[PDB]
């Protein structure tokens, strides 16, 4: 299956998907984020962030406290495996990461860290 | 010859090379950019961008006008064949692209689109 996935974060606080699967044979994997709608990022900014399932909460709460100027992400957060930047409607961003960062059996989660968004905009990433 | 090259963009506005040659037999090619020095990206950020020689100017000027928040690159610029992100000193990024995107005889150029950098930080990429 393709070594990349196109994700949309819309004005209704939704990702167009809640489960991503990464093909074990890909040397790399790329996420392409877009923002259909009209709301600017200071009001409806969306990012795509990846961590183990266990680290999600801490990344989300430290991220909230970091501010908009930081893309609601804690600088040098060691729990973040890969991330795009905070995007506003009509904008785009992509992130590529080595498939060797993921492990079999481990449970990953992708999510948005804009305040209050993680509750709806979140999902699983599994290596298969 | 190797299917990858390590490039350095330093605080003096220089690439450690002005000519790259891509081995026709490689299925893919990877550029590894680094930034020796101390200047942050908002002051001395460097990226590695590839286009035909004819498209370089337009990519550079539209890039400038896009801003720092966009890595001084026009969103969805169709003229861009491959690119890394804008990097600051002590940082790193890599880009891999299919060697099949390049054509024999065509003339490519790699360059930095941080304002005013393309004048010094530029070079040729040829498929051989
Ligand atoms: Cu596949
Ligand atoms: Cu969001
Ligand atoms: Cu070779
Ligand atoms: Cu530069």
Curated annotation (Swiss-Prot), chains A, B:
<keyword id="KW-0186">Copper</keyword>
<dbReference type="InterPro" id="IPR008972">
    <property type="entry name" value="Cupredoxin"/>
</dbReference>
<keyword id="KW-0732">Signal</keyword>
<dbReference type="InterPro" id="IPR050845">
    <property type="entry name" value="Cu-binding_ET"/>
</dbReference>
<feature type="disulfide bond">
    <location>
        <begin position="3"/>
        <end position="26"/>
    </location>
</feature>
<dbReference type="GO" id="GO:0042802">
    <property type="term" value="F:identical protein binding"/>
</dbReference>
<dbReference type="GO" id="GO:0005886">
    <property type="term" value="C:plasma membrane"/>
</dbReference>
<feature type="binding site">
    <location>
        <position position="46"/>
    </location>
    <ligand>
        <name>Cu cation</name>
    </ligand>
</feature>
<keyword id="KW-1015">Disulfide bond</keyword>
<feature type="binding site">
    <location>
        <position position="117"/>
    </location>
    <ligand>
        <name>Cu cation</name>
    </ligand>
</feature>
<feature type="binding site">
    <location>
        <position position="112"/>
    </location>
    <ligand>
        <name>Cu cation</name>
    </ligand>
</feature>
<keyword id="KW-0813">Transport</keyword>
<feature type="domain" description="Plastocyanin-like">
    <location>
        <begin position="1"/>
        <end position="128"/>
    </location>
</feature>
<dbReference type="InterPro" id="IPR014068">
    <property type="entry name" value="Azurin"/>
</dbReference>
<dbReference type="InterPro" id="IPR028871">
    <property type="entry name" value="BlueCu_1_BS"/>
</dbReference>
<keyword id="KW-0574">Periplasm</keyword>
<dbReference type="GO" id="GO:0008270">
    <property type="term" value="F:zinc ion binding"/>
</dbReference>
<dbReference type="GO" id="GO:0009055">
    <property type="term" value="F:electron transfer activity"/>
</dbReference>
<dbReference type="InterPro" id="IPR000923">
    <property type="entry name" value="BlueCu_1"/>
</dbReference>
<protein>
    <recommendedName>
        <fullName>Azurin</fullName>
    </recommendedName>
</protein>
<dbReference type="GO" id="GO:0005507">
    <property type="term" value="F:copper ion binding"/>
</dbReference>
<dbReference type="GO" id="GO:0046914">
    <property type="term" value="F:transition metal ion binding"/>
</dbReference>
<dbReference type="GO" id="GO:0042597">
    <property type="term" value="C:periplasmic space"/>
</dbReference>
<comment type="function">
    <text>Transfers electrons from cytochrome c551 to cytochrome oxidase.</text>
</comment>
<dbReference type="Pfam" id="PF00127">
    <property type="entry name" value="Copper-bind"/>
</dbReference>
<feature type="binding site">
    <location>
        <position position="121"/>
    </location>
    <ligand>
        <name>Cu cation</name>
    </ligand>
</feature>
<keyword id="KW-0479">Metal-binding</keyword>
<keyword id="KW-0249">Electron transport</keyword>
């Amino acid at each position: 299956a393709e070594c990349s996935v196109d994700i949309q974060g819309n004005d209704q606080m939704q990702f167009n998907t809640n489960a991503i699967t990464v093909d074990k044979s890909c040397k790399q994997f790329t996420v392409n984020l877009s923002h259909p709608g009209n709301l600017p990022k200071n009001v409806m900014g969306h990012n795509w962030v990846l961590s183990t399932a266990a680290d999600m909460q801490g990344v989300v709460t430290d991220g909230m406290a970091s501010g908009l100027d930081k893309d609601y992400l804690k600088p040098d957060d060691s729990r973040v495996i890969a991330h795009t930047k905070l995007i506003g409607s009509g904008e785009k961003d992509s992130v590529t990461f080595d498939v060797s960062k993921l492990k079999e059996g481990e449970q990953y989660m992708f999510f948005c860290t804009f305040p209050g968004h993680s509750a709806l905009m979140k999902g699983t990433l599994t290596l298969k």
